[PDB]
Amino acid sequence: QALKKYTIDLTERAEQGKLDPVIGRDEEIRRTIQVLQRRTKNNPVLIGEPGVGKTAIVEGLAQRIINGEVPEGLKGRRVLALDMGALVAGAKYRGEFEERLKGVLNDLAKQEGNVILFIDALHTMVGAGMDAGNMLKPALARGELHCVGATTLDEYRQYIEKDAALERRFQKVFVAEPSVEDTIAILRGLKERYELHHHVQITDPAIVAAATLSHRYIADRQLPDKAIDLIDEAASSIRMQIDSKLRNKVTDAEIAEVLARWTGIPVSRMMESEREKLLRMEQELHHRVIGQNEAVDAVSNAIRRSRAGLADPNRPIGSFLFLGPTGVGKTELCKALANFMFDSDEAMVRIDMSEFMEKHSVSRLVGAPPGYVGYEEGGYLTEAVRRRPYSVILLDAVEKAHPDVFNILLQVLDDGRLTDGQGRTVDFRNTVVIMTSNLGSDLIQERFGELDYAHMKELVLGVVSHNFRPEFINRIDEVVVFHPLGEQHIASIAQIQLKRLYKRLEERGYEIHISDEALKLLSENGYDPVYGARPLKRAIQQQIENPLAQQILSGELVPGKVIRLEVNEDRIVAVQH
Amino acid sequence: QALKKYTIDLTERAEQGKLDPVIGRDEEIRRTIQVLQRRTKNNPVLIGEPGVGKTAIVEGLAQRIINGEVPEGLKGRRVLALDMGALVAGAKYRGEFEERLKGVLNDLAKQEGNVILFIDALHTMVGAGMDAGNMLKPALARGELHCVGATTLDEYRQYIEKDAALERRFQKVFVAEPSVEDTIAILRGLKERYELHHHVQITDPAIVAAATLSHRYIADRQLPDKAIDLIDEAASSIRMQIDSKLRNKVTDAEIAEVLARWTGIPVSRMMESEREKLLRMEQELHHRVIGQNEAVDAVSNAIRRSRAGLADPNRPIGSFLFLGPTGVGKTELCKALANFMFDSDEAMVRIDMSEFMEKHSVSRLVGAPPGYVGYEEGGYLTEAVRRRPYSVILLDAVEKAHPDVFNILLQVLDDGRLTDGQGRTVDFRNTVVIMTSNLGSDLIQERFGELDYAHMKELVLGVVSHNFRPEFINRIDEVVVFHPLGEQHIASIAQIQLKRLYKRLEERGYEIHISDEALKLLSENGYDPVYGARPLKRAIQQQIENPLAQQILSGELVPGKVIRLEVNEDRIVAVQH
Amino acid sequence: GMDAGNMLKPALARGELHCVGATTLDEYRQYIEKDAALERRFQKVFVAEPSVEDTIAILRGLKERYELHHHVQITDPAIVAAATLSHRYIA
Amino acid sequence: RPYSVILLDAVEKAHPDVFNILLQVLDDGRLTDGQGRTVDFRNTVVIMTSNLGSDLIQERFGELDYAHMKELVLGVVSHNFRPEFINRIDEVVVF
Ligand SMILES: Nc1ncnc2c1ncn2[C@@H]1O[C@H](COP(=O)(O)OP(=O)(O)OP(O)(O)=S)[C@@H](O)[C@H]1O
Ligand SMILES: Nc1ncnc2c1ncn2[C@@H]1O[C@H](COP(=O)(O)OP(=O)(O)O)[C@@H](O)[C@H]1O
Ligand SMILES: Nc1ncnc2c1ncn2[C@@H]1O[C@H](COP(=O)(O)OP(=O)(O)O)[C@@H](O)[C@H]1O
């Protein structure tokens, strides 16, 4: 016979107990029993995006047939898993696959309607040699074959809904992804099975945490399989930490460590080390951003409102409109924010809006529509956020952008979603959009003297109201205003540049000190109201990197010696003492 | 049993010491024990480059099993390599090989999970013509086999990531290339094994030299395999030098001899030092370009200052300004610098920047937005850099463009990067940027005498300071002065062309010489104050070759005559003596 | 034709065989660089296509061979011209 | 037939990746096909036509020389083509 060859018995395996005792799913199984008890077209196909457990539905049906919870037309059935891969094995000759398939069909006709077939990956049945649909297809029509498909919706619309007769043979039992409490019940049955597997124990707050956070963070896989993967690798981690040298109980700290190994996101709560960071988040950000207190207050309040569960699950973490003097640390607050937010000065997406001066540049930023040249790789913003969900976007110099781009940002800052050219949505609810401009720079550099921050923000917000449309400036979470710098802040910037210079040259091997008079000459040589601290940057770079490295590479200076940077009338001389 | 017939044990070999104690890769073995102790996804397939010892990871796993360095789920587990040889041999009949693998899987089902299978070349078992692999998918589906695979990433993404059951019965183990010191420790253990084997000796500075020379040069083979090949074939070379016509230690000079005898062929004197390589870089730059050492040594000084690394590595390497006469050797200097510096002449990007004056022209030097014209061409300025990661960019006629292109160039000299129209990062921090103009063409062509390199440099530096941006000369490391040609350049280039012509005629069988007066006539027929060498090229070609090839195909010239290229009254004739 | 390879592939992976191979780089790149049990039993010996003068000496030995065969005479300028014209023209 | 005459007639119409193919030709004389191997082009006369200097020559070939005409139409083709392509020509003769 061929049923022993090519078909696997499920009801024997559910009778031995070698399957998942899946909990729930009763409405899909009731619809499958509706379809399997018809007269013609007895052919359900289970359509779901992967991971929703369609194999689990058919095996739960097999378990109900064994236990006897089925109507009086399914008692005694044998559910058989046909293998479409195991039939195209030796078919290298002519008419050899047809021998196997018709042997299977004659055996299933000889069984006299007591066998429910189950073709997992039903899209494989289309091409297996015309060829493989076109032998089953009258048996699927006349209802004598009680086939049960199990497919994915993308594969269904690609393979089967192009072939119309095979599409009308089957019946769609549309399977949705289960909820989080349903996933909890699933993981309770599997908690019994896993605690009998590893000889470990599992705690139910870890189960509800794993299911909820796996719905929250991993949007790539689907529930419940990603949750089961979390639970099982947590169990294996505990099982190896038993014999790597002491628990037997899995808690959600282990789930957080496993999920950090998966995706890297700060899933863990306050461990009283990053909480001391977050309570002094302002004092943290003043290690790199000296002064500019109001916006540091606002942005650290935005992150502290995000981490505390007070974050709105529709809007992003925060929109921001940076104004003020041109170029002081817009970029420095942004890069230090990316540093103390997730990693470093590299997990940001900078988009210079001065490039975006026409509408086809807006086509660049969103993406090309179908039937156009750059359709196949999408836009620039939305591809960047699909790469980097947990990031900070820096739209830089938004005043040079054509005002239509603010409509893209209307969508962005309304609901955290933006649809690119290829017809897909991007979630912005894990980003911090920050937009910089200079639409009040002369006014803020002039009338800052003894005018408070509130009325200054009011007046420059009126200016921006004359600039933009009211629709967009309603969407801004908080406009903040940078104030102009002072000379002690210039001294602080010079101290930070001397610290990184001493770090680089101590990694090189030198020990260099400086006089305070040289720092005063740098503060003289590095400021204007119209540019700010980039004159200080180029002044430090010219007056240090050019003469001192020339003195070092002249075979003159020795590593290890104290190199006191003495001053000159116009320059900086170095000594070996 | 077929366990002794079609499986090869590895635990017996490590028990009897018939394997090799592979050092390192602790994290991968730990994650493999994580994956092998689950209930789902229980089959890790090792994924890495060819020649990285994934089978060595399995051997170290089996050594930890035998020695007892495994958790309490692997003590008592055997590791059996499935014999691809006799099995893939026996694939003649439809029932001969199938019976073999059937009996093998019946034996593995009889072992009841107590025995772990090993399979190498997993894609070969998947693609074999249930031909081979879906004979095992009814076992790996039902969970009666806990085997471990090994394949390359391309075969895993094509043959396994495409499939549906096969994608989920397997797990990724992402092995990469080992580090330098890991290779050092592995080669120390193999030094012990080889000095016990070949009865020769191996030097440990020769080991770290072999690792460095292997990682720098051999690109196809990877670590550890190329280093092991160097060490052991050098040991065989020392063994042959015992019976050559003494020595027992494998020294680093022997490693350099093996490296030269392989397909890399370096000079070992080139691999002695980097500063001697800088001095020979200078000397070979004074070979293809004859005379005029000032700008060449200035570029050499700038290159040594960049390779000293005392400046910012967030900027590109080179920033010069070749001025004066156009096309007389700026191209040749760029080709010689790119040749002797990194690899060859193809590290050049010669772009006439007089083209990009319109707005969409500026869009084409970054790339067209998605859905539009020049998108598939690329950005024309970054596309040559992405393919040439260590290039020398030659911007010709940079002053004849739009000022925002100069802003883009300042962004290049600032950040060392530029995002193209296709939406990715293009790094510029390893290239040599050279821009040219003609502000000092006649300033040098009329004042070649009585003015040295420094005063002409200060004069044309004042000229460029009057003409161009202040930020333009801020970012140039040295505004150099490219030299006008002398007559020794003319004589050198003309004699090189005569050398290749005399080589081709000697291959035909003609020995021809030239008088000095004919070289004077060529120098007068080739020289012009704006072009120089290439009118000399076409003048040499015409005035020599065309009457000569008229005469050779006239039956006039016979090989075996002293042929001096004498002169006419004002022309050049070939005579026979 | 088990036939000739996959019985000798156990001789690879059993520590007995001392074989020497030779093939085209085409079938090397297409058939030999793929197999797993065939990698760590072999080693690339890149045979160089010979130079001019080595070809000249080989042709002088075979000049003796062919003058013994055809009962004609072969000139050595014709040999060096044959090797040079073959290298210059035929690809 | 390795000794032949190849007329790539009116080459300016085609797509610029074909000019990448011909850069391979003029660089080496060997060209990889789809099967994989390479074919020697070092005995053929690869001739190309165009008309990219049409109105330029029908305007200015009168009362001008021949050399600066070649220079000016070389500038026109430098607007059209790539500089490596006009670099790797033996000689661009202009009608
Ligand atoms: N109701 C359920 N109860 C218990 N486990 C379930 C349930 N539904 C799904 N699962 C688990 O989900 C995992 C795989 O689910 P499946 O439904 O088999 O995925 P799938 O239907 O095969 O989708 P693809 O495309 O074939 S991967 C297994 O670990 C099942 O145990
Ligand atoms: N608060 C600060 N602390 C330390 N350095 C800063 C601070 N603010 C500005 N800088 C320096 O000022 C410069 C301003 O550059 P940037 O932020 O790009 O200009 P813009 O203000 O136009 O965004 C930066 O290069 C940075 O090094
Ligand atoms: N830790 C190690 N110690 C010694 N030799 C090793 C080690 N890792 C790999 N090798 C060498 O690598 C070769 C095995 O190749 P392998 O790693 O199985 O191929 P792949 O690189 O495709 O996985 C053996 O010759 C072995 O000597």
Tokens (6 digits) for A402: 């054509």
Cis bond before residue B224 (omega within 30° of 0): yes
CA of B79 to the centre of ligand 3 (A): 18
CA B147 – ligand 2 centroid, Å: 57
Ligand 1 pocket mutation pick from A13, A46, A228, A229 by most atoms within 8 angstroms of CB: A228
**Nearest alpha carbon, ligand 1 atom 29:** A225
Ligand 1 contact via A153 beta carbon (within 6 Å): no
Q: Is B290 on the interface with C (CB under 8 A)?
A: no
What residues in B contact A377, CB-CB < 8 Å? Answer: 370, 422-423
Place of tokens 């021998």: A99
Q: Of B495, B496, B512, whose CA–CA distance to B551 is shortest?
A: B512
What is the CA angle B480-B485-B487, rounded to 5?
A: 155
**Closest-lying ligand to the alpha carbon of B224?**
3
**Pair of tokens at residue B520:** 């004077």
Contact B393, B416 (CB under 8 A): no
Q: What are the residues whose beta carbons fall under 8 Å from the beta carbon of B92, sequence distance 6 or more?
A: C2
Dist. CA B428–CA B440, nearest whole Å: 28
**Cβ–Cβ contact D16 with B under 8 A:** yes
> Has A330 been labeled as part of a binding site?
yes
- Is B55 assigned a ligand-binding role in the annotation? yes
Q: Which atom of ligand 2 is nearest to the CA of A324?
A: 21
Contact A175, A149 (CB under 8 A): no
Q: Is the CB of A438 under 6 A from ligand 2?
A: no
CA–CA distances in Å: residue B3 to residues B81, B100, B178, C37: 10, 11, 35, 19
Pick from C8, C39, C89 the residue to mutate for testing the B interface (most B CBs within 10 Å): C39
In angstroms, the separation between the Cα of residue C33 and the nearest Cα of chain D is: 17
Q: Can you spell out the DSSP letters for B152-185?
A: EHHHHHHHTSS-SHHHHS-EEEE-----HHHHHH
Check the annotation: does B575 bind a ligand.
no
Euclidean distance between CA atoms A481 and A478, whole angstroms: 10
Return phi, psi of residue A352, to 5°. Answer: -75, 110
The dihedrals phi and psi of B45, each to the nearest 5 degrees, come to -105, 130
Question: Cα dist. B142→A115, A315, A481, B137 in Å?
Answer: 20, 46, 64, 8
Nearest ligand (C-alpha, residue B20): 3
Cα gap B360→A361, rounded to integer Å: 11
Gap from D9 CA to chain C (nearest CA, Å)? 27
Distance to chain D for C87, nearest Cα, Å: 12
Interface of B with C in 211-270 (CB under 8 A): 229, 263
CA gyration radius for chain C? 20
Instruction: Name the residue type at position A286.
Output: H
The DSSP annotation for D19-66 comes to HHHHHHHHHHSEEE-SSS-EEE-TTSEEEE---TTHHHHHHHSTTS-S
Contact C46 B92 (CB under 8 A): no
Assess contact for A64 and A77: CB atoms under 8 A. no
Experimental technique: cryo-EM
Is there a contact between A55 and A27 (Cβ–Cβ < 8 Å)?
no
Two tokens, residue B143: 């969970």
Rounded CA-CA distance D92/D10 in Å is: 14
Question: What is the signed CA dihedral for A471, A474, A475, A481, rounded to 10 degrees?
Answer: 130
Q: How many CB atoms lie within 10 A of CB B166?
A: 21
Instruction: Measure the CA–CA gap between D87 and B30, rounded to whole angstroms.
Output: 58
Under an 8 A CB cutoff, do B120 and C36 touch?
yes
Residues pairing with B434 in the sheet: B320, B394
Find the helix or strand (DSSP H, E) in which C76 lies. Answer: helix C76-88
Say if CB B285 and CB B336 are below 8 A apart: yes
Smallest Cα–Cα separation from B239: which of B229, B230, B249?
B249
B54-67 and B26-35 are packed helices; what angle lies between their axes, rounded to 10 degrees? 80
Pick from A264, A366, A326: nearest CA to A531:
A326
Compute CA distances B267 → B134, B285, B286, whole Å.
53, 18, 20
Interface contact C89, partner D, CB < 8 A: yes
- Residue of A13, A19, A186 with the most ligand 1 atoms within 8 Å of its CB, for mutation: A186
| Residue carrying the six token digits 């394997």 | B19
The edge-to-edge listing of strands for the beta sheet with B149-152 is B149-152, B44-48, B171-174
Residues of C in contact with D43 (CB under 8 A): 89
Q: Are A19 and A182 in contact (CB under 8 A)?
A: no
For B438-574, where are the E strands, in sequence order?
A: 512-514, 563-567, 572-574
Instruction: Let me know: does B326 contact B529? Beta carbons within 8 Å.
Output: no
- Cα B156–chain centre separation: 26
Tell me the C-alpha distance between B88 and B378, whole Å: 48
Specify which residues D5 forms β-bridges with.
Answer: D45
Strands A115-120 and B572-574 turn out to be unpaired
CA A58/CA A11 separation, integer angstroms:
10
With a 6 A CB cut-off, is A437 part of the ligand 2 pocket?
no
Q: Of all helices (H) and strands (E), which one includes residue A468?
A: none
Strands A78-82 and A7-9: antiparallel
Amino acid identity at B546: N
- Nearest residue (by CA) to ligand 3, atom 10, is B53
Minimal Cα–Cα distance from C61 to chain B, Å?
24
Length of chain B: 577
Q: Do B89 and C37 touch (CB under 8 A)?
A: no
Residue B174's DSSP bridge partners are: B47
Give the B window 508-547 contacts with A, CB below 8 Å.
Answer: none
How far apart are the C-alpha atoms of A2 and A80, rounded to whole Å?
Answer: 12
Query: What secondary structure does DSSP assign to B341-401, as a single string?
Result: HTS-TT-EEEEETTS--SHHHHHHTT-PPTTSGGGTT--SSSHHHHH-SS-EEEEESGGGS
Place of tokens 């998918």: B137
Q: Report DSSP state, residue A138.
A: H
Sign of the CA dihedral B64, B68, B69, B71?
positive
Would you call D59 exposed, middle or buried from its count of C-beta atoms within 10 A (0-12, 13-18, 19+)?
Answer: exposed
Ligand nearest to the CA of A396: 2
Exposure string of B29-39, with b = 16+ CB inside 10 Å and e = fewer, is: bebbbbbbbbb
C-alpha A237, offset from chain centre: 24
Q: Measured between alpha carbons, how far is C32 from C19 in angstroms, rounded to an integer?
A: 15
From the CA of A444, how far away is ligand 2's center (Å)? 17
What are the tokens at B357? Answer: 């004056």
Looking at the CA of residue A53, tell me the nearest atom of ligand 1.
Answer: 17
Helix then strand then coil, in percent of chain B rounded to 5, is: 50, 10, 40
Using a 6 Å cutoff on CB, does residue A491 contact ligand 2? no
Cα end-to-end span (Å), chain A: 96
